[model samples]
Target: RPRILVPGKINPRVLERLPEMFETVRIERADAALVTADMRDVSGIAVSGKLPVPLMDAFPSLEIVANFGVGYDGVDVSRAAARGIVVTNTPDVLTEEVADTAIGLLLNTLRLLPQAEQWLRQGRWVREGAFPLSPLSLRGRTVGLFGLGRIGLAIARRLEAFGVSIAYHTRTPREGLGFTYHPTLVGMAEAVDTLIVIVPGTASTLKAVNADVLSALGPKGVLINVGRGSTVDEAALVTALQNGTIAGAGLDVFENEPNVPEALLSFPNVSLLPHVASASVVTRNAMSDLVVDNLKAWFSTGEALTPVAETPFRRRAIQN
Candidate 1:
């Protein structure tokens, strides 16, 4: 009987659907033990946050990997591709959910939501100290997006409803689009009141949002990153916020995740959130379901529902 392995925990809703999806399945935390020879004999992997092809080397029987998120950063796709293993990831389904979180961060940062909450909780309302705040509205502001993919376009669509102008910077200019296409990311920062970093996490984009561009955004602009932590420079971001180099920031993903810089903790204008762009119940369930769906499809037809290649950087696989 074919079997499957699931890494990372899932909601009770998805847990109920596993038995029907695969003949036999092992669902466990994404640690080394689960990737053992015995478990690898399984036919497929149903993954969420972490799991990669290198772990599957022990299981020659392993044939497929299905990522439970839009971004496949956690899995090494190129290696899987070279091994003739199929890989699939949930993408378009997450566009709107992540975009919603981006806008939420944008509003929270510029409107000083954190500071207002702290004041209410600290009894500042009854004290004699003057409560300080700086508020900005989303309407009538220009927004610059770093990437012009699905999620970026979703953000632009939503911002359009708010009467905000949208522009973007891409590797190549998109023709016939109404939005302005900045020749460079720095130019985009210079043209907008808010800069939203939605680029994928990878080597070329590492620290894509850095000191120079943050500086270009100026002291009154807000920056929001809902994409990946590795794309931003944590130290530089904290430094920019500390010296008032920028007005504020809304961060969902961090350079190292959950490990936010200490300097940013004290900044009231800075909004910090756990990486939850695609955490909504509706989106997560669909992703989890597709994880199983892709695996079943690959084993049945030798092709994944959404097969992806391994990342550019990976240890060379030894041929037997």
Candidate 2:
């Protein structure tokens, strides 16, 4: 079997299947100390978390990095492209799952469903008599999606059936999608009180949702973030919530993974989820299959099945 590297923890299915196809070397994590000169002959890496450029430099023969998620921000694509190493990510497979999570989170935030459940569990409904009704409703709300990509469009499509007006902001207008397009994010925030962020994590998008945008969202506005946490200014968001800049928020990803601010914890209007947008067993298994399939496709046919957006690989050219 050809030698391959398992640089970080991944789905168990990938781990279970890897050894059957290739000689596998597992590292607890990516570090210079863990990778020895003897492993330089490795030709592929199956990774889920951060795979730095320096780590890639360690494997002289590394031909591909089959990442295990839709978001490839953890992988240094520019450096990989420079070194002619192909990168693949699990996309479409997790699109509906993530979009569903986004919509669910938004509903929970607006209706206080989780809080209502907690109230019933605590006997507050009996003691206090009739659980308080939420003032917020999906009707008469205009929603703006910050980045109208694959997952964003899916979310918008789902929201359409709910009877909410939709608008979106992207680098440029996507023609024929039918939803209104805003040339600027701030303008979108001003136009619509409900803003759902679904942009990628990039240097350009770091803290892209700042004080001005939050303020534009206004006091009655509700913000939903299914995108990377780095895309929003965490401190500014905390301040916005504290001062009533926005009515409420639903967040799936955070600026820092697994660590959220104490201030955000106490807010009654906010809904928080620990990055489980694509955590369903079906979606996760599909993602793992894609990761392994990409690697298998590369070694078997000299092409990746699903290359990352930054790569030179084009689906049309590959098909031809």
Candidate 3:
């Protein structure tokens, strides 16, 4: 059997399933220094986090990498593609689950559902008056989507049923979409009071939602991020909330995940989650299955199931 290096921690499914098709090697961390002569023949890698360029270089025979999430930015695609190594990620499986969470988060932020329930749990409803009315409402609000990829399109479908006007800004406008399109991030923020960021964490998206975008969103604006954390400038977000540049924010992902800024917690309006957009058991299982299946397909035939644009995969036409 071919060897597949299991880098760091990934879904246990990958660990369990890959052994059926390939020899599994589990390393505590994805360190290039840890690569041994025995691992030189490693033909595949399954990882949920960063797979550095040096680490890729360490594996002389690596042919494919199966990443866990929809975004493969953690993996150095340039090096992988340059080396003729194909990369695959789980994308469509988690779209509806995340889009549902985005809507839930949006509602939680706007209605203060969690806080209100906590107030009731605290016995404040009996001890005091009813919870104060939320300052924001989904009603009469225009929503702008920062990216219109798979999950974003799923979100828009839900928003359409909610009856709010929708607008979007992507690098290139998706053809035949009726939602209003904006040429720039600032323009999108200017046109809509609610901005939901669903873009990946790429160089172009790093701090894409800055002070200017927040300022354009205006005081009544609400921001929700179901995408990667690096896209938003944390310092600018703090300043915006402090200065009323925007009303509030709901975030599932943060710049430094599992370590949100203390100032953000201080606000009663901010709704936070521990990156559970695709956390449900069903969704995670599907994602894990996709990850394992990609590796299976790649090793069984010289093609990956869901190859990213950076490294497109096609099986050899002439199989001798």
Q: Against the true structure, whose lDDT is highest? A: 3
C-alpha local distance difference test of each model: 0.77, 0.88, 0.90
Q: What is the lDDT of residue 265 in candidate 3?
A: 95
Query: What range of 10 consecutive residues in model 2 has the weakest lDDT sum?
Result: 311-320
Q: Is candidate 1 or candidate 3 better by lDDT?
A: 3
* Number of colliding residue pairs in model 2: 1
Number of the candidate with higher lDDT, 1 or 2 = 2
**For all candidates, what are the clash counts?**
6, 1, 0
What is the model-wide C-alpha lDDT for candidate 1?
Answer: 0.77
Model 1 weakest 10-residue run by lDDT: 311-320
Which tens-of-lDDT digit does each residue in 1-320 have in candidate 1? Answer: 56777666755555566677565455466766566545756767777677754565656876777777788777777667767666778877778888898888888887777677778789986784656646676767889999878888899999999888999998898877899999888888988879999877679889888899999988878889887888888888888988988888898988776777788778877888999888988988877777767766555554556666452222224231
Candidate 1 backbone collisions, by pair: 77-309, 77-310, 78-309, 78-310, 78-311, 229-254
Pick out the ten consecutive residues of candidate 3 with the lowest summed lDDT. Answer: 311-320
Q: How good is model 3 by TM-score? A: 0.96
Give per-residue CA lDDT, model 2, range 1-320, as digits (tens): 66878876789989877776788888888875799878989988999888877787888888888899988877888898888888999989999999999999999999999999999999999899877888786878999999978998899889999999999999999978889999998999999989999988778989999999999989889999998899999999999999988999999989877999899999999999999999999999999999988888777666888998778552223443
Query: In model 2, what is the error at residue 120, expressed in angstroms?
Result: 1.2
Candidate 2 local lDDT, residue 259: 95
